[PDB]
Design a protein around this nucleic acid. Structure first.
Ligand SMILES: [Mg+2]
Ligand SMILES: [Mg+2]
Ligand SMILES: [Mg+2]
Ligand SMILES: [Mg+2]
Ligand SMILES: [Mg+2]
Ligand SMILES: [Mg+2]
Ligand SMILES: [Mg+2]
Ligand SMILES: [Mg+2]
Ligand SMILES: [Mg+2]
Ligand SMILES: [Mg+2]
Ligand SMILES: [Mg+2]
Ligand SMILES: [Mg+2]
Ligand SMILES: [Mg+2]
Ligand SMILES: [Mg+2]
Ligand SMILES: [Mg+2]
Ligand SMILES: [Mg+2]
Ligand SMILES: [Mg+2]
Ligand SMILES: [Mg+2]
Ligand SMILES: [Mg+2]
Ligand SMILES: [Mg+2]
Ligand SMILES: [Mg+2]
Ligand SMILES: [Mg+2]
Ligand SMILES: [Mg+2]
Ligand SMILES: [Mg+2]
Ligand SMILES: [Mg+2]
Ligand SMILES: [Mg+2]
Ligand SMILES: [Mg+2]
Ligand SMILES: [Mg+2]
Ligand SMILES: [Mg+2]
Ligand SMILES: [Mg+2]
Ligand SMILES: [Mg+2]
Ligand SMILES: [Mg+2]
Ligand SMILES: [Mg+2]
Ligand SMILES: [Mg+2]
Ligand SMILES: [Mg+2]
Ligand SMILES: [Mg+2]
Ligand SMILES: [Mg+2]
Ligand SMILES: [Mg+2]
Ligand SMILES: [Mg+2]
Ligand SMILES: [Mg+2]
Ligand SMILES: [Mg+2]
Ligand SMILES: [Mg+2]
Ligand SMILES: [Mg+2]
Ligand SMILES: [Mg+2]
Ligand SMILES: [Mg+2]
Ligand SMILES: [Mg+2]
Ligand SMILES: [Mg+2]
Ligand SMILES: [Mg+2]
Ligand SMILES: [Mg+2]
Ligand SMILES: [Mg+2]
Lengths: 62, 48, 183, 109, 52
RNA sequence: GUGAACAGCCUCUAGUUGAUAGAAUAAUGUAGAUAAGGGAAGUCGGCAAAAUAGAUCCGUAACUUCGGGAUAAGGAUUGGC
RNA sequence: CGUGGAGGUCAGUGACGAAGCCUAGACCGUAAGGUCGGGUCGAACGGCCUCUAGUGCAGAUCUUGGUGGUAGUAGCAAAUAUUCAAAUGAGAACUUUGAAGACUGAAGUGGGGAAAGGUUCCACGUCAACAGCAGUUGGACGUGGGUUAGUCGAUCCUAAGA
RNA sequence: GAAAUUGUUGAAAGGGAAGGGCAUUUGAUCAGAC
């Protein structure tokens, strides 16, 4: 299971950096079927692929 | 296909030998450098 | 075929050889001499323990600047190592030669490595890069390894005395005398 | 013989990590922890739980805690027989402070 | 043939480069560059007293 | 964000976590450090290192092509509420 | 005495083994060398009388090729840094995902381009060599796919100049 | 399918090199013999 492709796609499709992307580790078999920008869009809406939250920078101290 | 892989087996092993001839026939003078200037210079010390 | 020098009866012995192995030659030659002459199962159990750092392979020829070790003591040498990659290819062969000894229907318990020899296979060649813009050969030292295991026979006890006695006319008469003396 | 245990050890990292190169401290924790747990329950094959791994690292490579309180279990190996029948498993246990506690055998049900 | 062994540009490196004085092929990037040239004793060089 | 600052130091968006590893911590090293008393006695030579440094207020000589010298030298202050 | 070729001759030797190579096996010669035996080998080759020469090597910092000692040694130490689980797999310090810790810190280790490169782009399959450890990974290897303009460029205009 | 160089077996020797000449002992080995 080599996911370096699908992780590069999801990044472009979900419109965010690679580092914010999250692939469900238990669906690894599943995701490996993706292979297409269209396929991926199921997986995003589906919920098995997700966009991680922006890490927090607070200005509250300043 | 065993017929298949036997053949790209040979070729690779033939080719790879012929790239060996090249690194050897080249080897003798490969370090030839006309116009090489030694970084190091030693003053000859004598007083006339 | 055409193995190295053999003192063995061909019917009772099984053999296995790898060629053009990617391993040090110098290192394999060392692990070879180690397990030579041993009983087969001894050899294997031992090679196992070397992978674990329990015992070691004494380096008896190419040792220069090798470290000292305690484990050397067993064979009475101060310089020893645990050459993992060498050991793999020897294990791989010993497992094999043991299988050929099986399909020849020889007895496994009575097997021991009779003859194990490793010489050097053709060098392979890359380049390295040195200061002042020079080049040097950077080279693998592949090996052929061959090994012959034998079924041990202590069954040979032979009495051959070839007597041609050359005795002069004097020595014959003199042996005669001793017989007339009732010895 | 080996019977399927579980205990709860405290380990002193602070005496074990003494004087070590800063960049390598967190990792020496993990070799230390492994070593320790092969001492007791001589299982020889150990596996850390990923959250134990966070418990070590929570301070970053320098600042490893003085005392951990861990739960070490000895379990049966599976399939594919490893060179050992037995198996060791570590995971951390939540506590206020790891001070003052002694090894307790966890009753297992 | 009278052209033989002479078909080359080779020069001597002169002394100071630590190798024989015999004229060598200049150039680069091929097996042949640097090698010995002309001379009667050299691979490829002219024979002694070419038959006329 | 600090700060005069596109300086240095910390983080956010994006990006990497790739530069052969493991075990010990002897000598000599390479880089980085600290030293009691003395204070250049060291050496061809204060070479190398140390000291000084920001801002504010005071004070500022000889000389001068009158523009400089000048941040001359030399003092005092600096946080939080 | 020896070697490459030439004329003559032994109605010379030879697949029932010619030449070549190997041989702390034998004999002849002061020696140059010659001759036999054994092992290997597989197609041509010698004695004598003469002819002819690109005709005899230990050296030339000789020339070309090959190989040692050195030596399993010197080394693989700049740029802060890795760790745990799982999947994959014959095989995992190094691949992929999750978790965690970190760094570049907007004059970037980010996003784009110019010159130069030329298919490196991207997928599938793959691990002999290559990636100075490894390798299941790759700018590697094999099979394919991919670059769409009335408006973005060139094209047109002139500059120093040709 | 030579040599350098290398592995295995066999035989031999070895107190800061090895190798050579004269002569014999020991071991190995071999022709002439009729
Ligand atoms: Mg040479
Ligand atoms: Mg050393
Ligand atoms: Mg030494
Ligand atoms: Mg280099
Ligand atoms: Mg260069
Ligand atoms: Mg210390
Ligand atoms: Mg010629
Ligand atoms: Mg400000
Ligand atoms: Mg700033
Ligand atoms: Mg920094
Ligand atoms: Mg990048
Ligand atoms: Mg990586
Ligand atoms: Mg490097
Ligand atoms: Mg020690
Ligand atoms: Mg002092
Ligand atoms: Mg003081
Ligand atoms: Mg003073
Ligand atoms: Mg002085
Ligand atoms: Mg003085
Ligand atoms: Mg001076
Ligand atoms: Mg100075
Ligand atoms: Mg002044
Ligand atoms: Mg002042
Ligand atoms: Mg105040
Ligand atoms: Mg002759
Ligand atoms: Mg001729
Ligand atoms: Mg013959
Ligand atoms: Mg000989
Ligand atoms: Mg001549
Ligand atoms: Mg010659
Ligand atoms: Mg010669
Ligand atoms: Mg001479
Ligand atoms: Mg020479
Ligand atoms: Mg060499
Ligand atoms: Mg070393
Ligand atoms: Mg390297
Ligand atoms: Mg270095
Ligand atoms: Mg580094
Ligand atoms: Mg790494
Ligand atoms: Mg930072
Ligand atoms: Mg681009
Ligand atoms: Mg690619
Ligand atoms: Mg692929
Ligand atoms: Mg490699
Ligand atoms: Mg490899
Ligand atoms: Mg390609
Ligand atoms: Mg239109
Ligand atoms: Mg336009
Ligand atoms: Mg052949
Ligand atoms: Mg030889």
């Amino acid at each position: 299971a080599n996911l370096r492709t699908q992780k590069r796609l999801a990044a472009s499709v979900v419109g965010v950096g690679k580092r914010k992307v999250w692939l469900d580790p238990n669906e690894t078999s599943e995701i490996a079927q993706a292979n297409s920008r269209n396929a991926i869009r199921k997986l995003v809406k589906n919920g098995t692929i997700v966009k991680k939250a922006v890490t927090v920078h607070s200005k509250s101290r300043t | 296909d065993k017929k298949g892989v036997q053949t790209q087996q040979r070729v690779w092993q033939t080719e790879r030998f012929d790239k060996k001839r090249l690194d050897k026939r080249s080897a003798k003078f490969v370090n030839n450098q006309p116009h090489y200037r030694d970084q190091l210079l030693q003053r000859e010390h004598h007083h006339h | 075929a055409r193995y190295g020098a053999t003192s063995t009866n061909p019917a009772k012995s099984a053999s296995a050889r790898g060629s053009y192995l990617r391993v040090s030659f110098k290192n394999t030659r060392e692990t070879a001499q180690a397990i030579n002459g041993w009983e087969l199962t001894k050899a294997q159990k031992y090679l196992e323990q070397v992978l674990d750092h329990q015992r070691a392979i004494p380096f008896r020829r190419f040792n220069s600047s090798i470290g000292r070790t305690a484990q050397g003591k067993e064979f009475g040498v101060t310089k020893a190592r645990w050459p993992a990659k060498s050991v793999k290819f020897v294990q791989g062969l010993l497992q094999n030669a043991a299988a050929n000894a099986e399909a020849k229907g020889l007895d496994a318990t009575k097997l021991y490595v009779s003859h194990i020899q490793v010489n050097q296979a053709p060098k392979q060649r890359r380049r390295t890069y040195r200061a002042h813009g020079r080049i040097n050969k950077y080279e693998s030292s592949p090996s052929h390894i061959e090994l012959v295991v034998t079924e041990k026979e202590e069954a040979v006890a032979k009495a051959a005395e070839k007597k041609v006695v050359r005795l002069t006319s004097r020595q014959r008469g003199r042996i005669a005398a001793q017989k007339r003396i009732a010895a | 013989l080996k019977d399927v245990v579980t205990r709860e050890y405290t380990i002193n990292l602070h005496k074990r990590l003494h004087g070590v190169s800063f960049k390598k401290r967190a990792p020496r924790a993990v070799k230390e922890i492994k070593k320790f747990a092969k001492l007791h329950m001589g299982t020889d094959d150990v596996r850390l739980a990923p959250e134990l791994n966070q418990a070590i690292w929570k301070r970053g490579v320098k600042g490893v805690e003085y005392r951990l309180r861990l739960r070490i279990s000895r379990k049966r190996n599976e399939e594919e027989d490893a060179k050992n029948p037995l198996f060791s498993y570590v995971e951390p246990v939540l506590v206020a402070s790891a001070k003052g506690l002694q090894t307790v055998v966890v009753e297992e049900d | 043939s009278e052209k033989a062994g002479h078909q080359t540009s080779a020069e001597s490196w002169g002394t100071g480069r630590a190798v024989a004085r015999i004229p060598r092929v200049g150039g680069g990037g091929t097996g042949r560059s640097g090698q010995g040239a002309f001379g009667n004793m050299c691979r490829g060089g002219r024979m002694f007293a070419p038959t006329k």
